Symmetry: C2
């Protein structure tokens, strides 16, 4: 249901480089007819199967197909799609506010109430996807972006659907991918996959946001994978001394091997840490603080 076969330079003014990854190169641009600004993600095509360099026809078509389905305020949106010999270039919504974790590291101070405000935006985006039977499959702090950095409470935008995949019911889908720090046990063990995996990733992102520490990350990839498979973590009191039991329960109910016993997105929204029932839960959440001292320490180390 296809791609524009024109030259993207005819219709857009490409300029500054925004941030290249391993397979794509993102650049700011400007539609000519309107003057509006977008991002332009130049994905590099593959050549024949098993060129290490590039991305396959099938997997670009998949990402573009999912992007078209996806209309939500907490999820990036696709404007147009061109292609040529070398690249397929996507004209995406310009999200120029930086990472979430970046903005949070700037923070003078940050309570668990303020923290859940950002978590909730994420849960809303992920709820929209999961309602449309889509699994992002690459939930991590790099892919959690801000539209405008200079707002009191900025607007989260989930990005990068390179690993996303529609889930059907009778159909199985097994594959190994992602960043080891943030993958569920079913990825590592090459077990059937679904929407559940995103809920694991959320439990991890939460853990790092509050404490600055990461639950399963070892010295080496080897260890990391052994930790995930064994579900070996703990709330080390050095970082989690100012963290609520509500917050810890949320994380603990997400970081669960059995996919069926793990929280759904609908259950995570209804969890009391995200949606307090009484006043005393609301106040515990207001008086609990994110560990920004240790969160800055670890976020600096990622550069």
């Amino acid at each position: 249901e296809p791609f524009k076969q024109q030259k993207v330079e005819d219709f857009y003014d490409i300029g500054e480089e925004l941030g290249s990854g391993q397979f794509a190169i993102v650049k700011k641009c400007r539609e000519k007819s309107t003057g509006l600004e977008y991002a332009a993600k130049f994905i590099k095509k593959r050549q024949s199967r098993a060129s290490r360099r590039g991305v396959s026809r099938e997997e670009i078509e998949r990402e573009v197909s999912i992007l078209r389905q996806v209309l939500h305020h907490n999820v990036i949106t696709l404007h147009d799609v061109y292609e040529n010999r070398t690249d397929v270039v996507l004209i995406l919504e310009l999200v120029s506010g930086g990472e979430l974790f970046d903005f949070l590291a700037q923070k003078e101070s940050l309570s668990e109430e303020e923290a859940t405000s950002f978590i909730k935006q994420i849960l809303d985006g992920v709820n929209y996807l999961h309602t449309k039977k889509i699994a992002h499959f690459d939930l991590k702090p790099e892919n959690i972006m801000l539209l405008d950095k200079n707002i009191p409470i900025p607007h989260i935008k989930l990005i990068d659907f390179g690993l996303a995949h529609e889930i059907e019911d009778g159909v199985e889908f097994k594959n190994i991918f992602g960043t080891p720090e943030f993958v569920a046990p079913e990825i590592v063990n090459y077990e059937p996959l679904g929407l559940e995996a995103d809920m694991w990733s959320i439990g991890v992102i939460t853990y790092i946001l509050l404490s600055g520490a990461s639950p399963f990350l070892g010295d080496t990839k080897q260890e990391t994978l052994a930790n995930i498979t064994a579900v070996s973590y703990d709330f080390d009191e050095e970082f989690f001394s100012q963290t609520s039991e509500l917050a810890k329960d949320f994380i603990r109910k997400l970081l669960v091997k059995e996919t069926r016993k793990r929280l759904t997105i609908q259950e995570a929204l209804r969890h009391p840490w995200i949606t307090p029932v009484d006043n005393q839960q609301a106040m515990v959440r207001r008086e609990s603080v994110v560990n920004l001292e240790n969160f800055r320490k670890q976020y600096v180390r990622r550069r």
Copy 2:
């Protein structure tokens, strides 16, 4: 048992770039004291754990540790190891004859006998490693190099020990890594690992050498992995019509899920396709022919 802490440029004249990967950049260089030529692999260090960019202290130390054990004509050899704020640089034997598969694609013609000549060199290298309880863990056509391209029968050198690991006996090793096209089922399934894995790789490498095709490679990674785990392949007669049964038996005994029932390096070397026992096995091997037609076709598609 450490790294030189001096500036590598003081002692070596670095020059032309030779072939950067993702974590390392390799450059031709020249020892100043001797005038001799080496390859200098500049490995980029990590910063703190999970920087996607870099290589960890522990994993550089392991590569260097395995490199210092490794003395064989069919295996690259480590000369020196400097380091600095940014990189650990290894001074490795210069291997400048290109990949094996590249040389073979230049071939006028190539019989199974001539092919096993190169396969033997590979098995000899691998045997040496496996005798020293080392697993390469990254056997593939890119890491099978030639020393001098312009010789009738060139000299194979296994390279890149970035994934290599010493296998003990009681000790278990489980990890996920490598190139999907060439990993054994135990990698994919996160099952305990050892020397066997390399042998599966050799089976895949042989398969491609002979036919130009690849046994498990699918359209997407998803399919490739399913194919490995299911051990789903076949000898499509379009590519294997001029391939001997001996050749097909060797491959078939290596591409086996069960690690115990798979061929060991010693069993591979003794296999009749490698080591005939009568004259008629020898003749079948001379008269059977590598499919350079299809081999070139695919090897071209892997380019730039």
